[PDB]
Scaffold this active site. Sequence first.
Site, mmCIF file in Angstrom:
data_model
loop_
_atom_site.group_PDB
_atom_site.id
_atom_site.type_symbol
_atom_site.label_atom_id
_atom_site.label_comp_id
_atom_site.label_asym_id
_atom_site.label_seq_id
_atom_site.Cartn_x
_atom_site.Cartn_y
_atom_site.Cartn_z
ATOM 1 N N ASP B 48 0.845 -1.187 0.000
ATOM 2 C CA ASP B 48 0.000 0.000 0.000
ATOM 3 C C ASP B 48 0.881 1.238 0.000
ATOM 4 O O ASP B 48 1.836 1.326 0.778
ATOM 5 C CB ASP B 48 -0.945 0.013 1.205
ATOM 6 N N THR B 81 -5.319 6.920 -3.563
ATOM 7 C CA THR B 81 -4.211 7.735 -3.086
ATOM 8 C C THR B 81 -2.906 7.438 -3.809
ATOM 9 O O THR B 81 -1.926 8.163 -3.605
ATOM 10 C CB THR B 81 -4.016 7.527 -1.584
ATOM 11 N N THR B 82 -2.870 6.402 -4.646
ATOM 12 C CA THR B 82 -1.675 6.055 -5.399
ATOM 13 C C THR B 82 -1.776 6.391 -6.878
ATOM 14 O O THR B 82 -0.744 6.440 -7.552
ATOM 15 C CB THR B 82 -1.366 4.558 -5.253
ATOM 16 N N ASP B 382 -13.709 1.920 7.215
ATOM 17 C CA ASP B 382 -13.515 2.095 5.777
ATOM 18 C C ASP B 382 -14.846 2.105 5.027
ATOM 19 O O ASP B 382 -15.138 3.038 4.266
ATOM 20 C CB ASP B 382 -12.590 0.997 5.246
#
Lengths: 167, 508
Positions: B48, B81-82, B382
Amino acid sequence: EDERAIEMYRRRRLAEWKATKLKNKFGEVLEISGKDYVQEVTKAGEGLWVILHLYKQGIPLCALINQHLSGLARKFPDVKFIKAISTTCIPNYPDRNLPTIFVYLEGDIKAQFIGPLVFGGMNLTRDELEWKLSESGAIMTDLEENPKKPIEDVLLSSVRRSVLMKR
Amino acid sequence: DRDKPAQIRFSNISAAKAVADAIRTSLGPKGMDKMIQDGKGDVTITNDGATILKQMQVLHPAARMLVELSKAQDIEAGDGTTSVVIIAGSLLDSCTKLLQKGIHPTIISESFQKALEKGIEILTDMSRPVELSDRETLLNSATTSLNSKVVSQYSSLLSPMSVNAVMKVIDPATATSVDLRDIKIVKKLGGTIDDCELVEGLVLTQKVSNSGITRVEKAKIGLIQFCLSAPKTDMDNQIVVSDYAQMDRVLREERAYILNLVKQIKKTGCNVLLIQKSILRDALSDLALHFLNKMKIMVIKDIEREDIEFICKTIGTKPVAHIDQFTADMLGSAELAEEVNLNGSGKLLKITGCASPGKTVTIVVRGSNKLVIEEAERSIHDALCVIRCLVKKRALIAGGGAPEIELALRLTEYSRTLSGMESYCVRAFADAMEVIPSTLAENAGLNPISTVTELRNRHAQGEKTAGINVRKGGISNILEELVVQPLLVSVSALTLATETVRSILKID
């Protein structure tokens, strides 16, 4: 009821608080870096025989002796001990030398055992590290002498037996 | 001059490129395994990007901008987010050669603004809308989310989140106001995963006391951030250490000091109290506990700051620091107490306080395994962010890389039709847009060139076709392999990426 109930107060308070006066002796061995050595001639207390060491890494002998001390401490409680690393003290001496414990009786060094040879060279056991002390405590297992009887040369003792038995 | 700005720009470009490709190859469900060592004898295995980027950094501002960009995207939407850093890196790699061509930053900035205004419109027109009004709309959208979610081999079976979460924070129904602090969650070991339940009131979990019986209802306990251990005397011993002197004197002093305080506090009712932690207050009294035993004690100690704000919000009781302020703002309604270790472990209590009707809930998680506390936890966090983001978008789009190449084709057409100085810039933007499906094919493992060419052809055919199916490594529509997402997670990403690239390009 309430009297007995309440009045256990003084039975409880000032009773657990009766046990608030304490005092100590010493045991085992504590890891200590150079941050206390400086004032240690004055940190000695009263009559508290202390012992030192000096450490390096990679020497087959230097690990051994570090075990014999912590064992001895269990025998004699009053004395205390120290395990140290030579990087803390004078920089280029400790590399060519070997462990030298500078016993401090709240004063000047009294027995400074430098280099390997003087120790013996891994022929050490509890005995060879206790009679060599002879200065802290007054027990020493009441051994008169014990040098292993340093193995002899055959020539000298020959003339001796002749002149003593046939005199 | 130009030497210093060009040099600083190239150094920042290299730094950003390096931090990008550091974690580039972990995007998608097939991120590879990576091991980093802190240098303090510890190695970790994870796939992650967020935590990896957060744990280490170089003392350079260009890295700090990417870190804050990632954290802003994280708090904003909660996913992707990546990919944001990948888009930023592609835009940077394009503008390198773009400025090599010799274009002023103003032209590039305004051209990127126009291209963004075009692409946002293209994206909003591409997506399809869904309904969010009633329970059925939201429930079917949630089912679509969970089947498009991570594999649910445990959630579909156990379901400590499928109903518990979504239902039990549907109360504060006002749109776009659902704080996380609204749903403080407790945990506890022991029991079984079989049940995770509901009370409209707070729930506390710690030892209370040992006395006759403690289960009653009255006005609220009354929160105190107090201290009731006498100040330690101004010496380690006293003037004289013996039996005769000091016991005659200090006995009465202490029996007065530790009695008059509870005497005063007895003025207000409920005969019960709650205290903060004890990092400074030392030697907690016991005779005080004995006294309160005569005075109907029921108390909890060692409460925490996070909880000390959350409770004061739940039950409407302003705090109190010390004895000399006890006028008002120290009470509240209450209805019961004394929940037990029912059929398990993790003692907890069930104060159901309807004093402040202001909506509030909590979630409890027991289980026959501590690994239940480990496996069921934070999944509600989440999925709850997932149901939080949908409350305002009510639209969704399919994955598979279709929108990327679709926008690329539309923006290439736009560059073709806007003939002029800005055409090359918006064209380069269109080219840099399409980088993700190739990376996905690589993560699965294939020849990406032919696949992306075929998919771009098919989207030149109908503009809404198959995406990327990770199941069989083939090209099938998302409408059967349901992997869908809301639209904001993409819209916000693109607009903030354009914003940050423009801002970093404008600065010298």
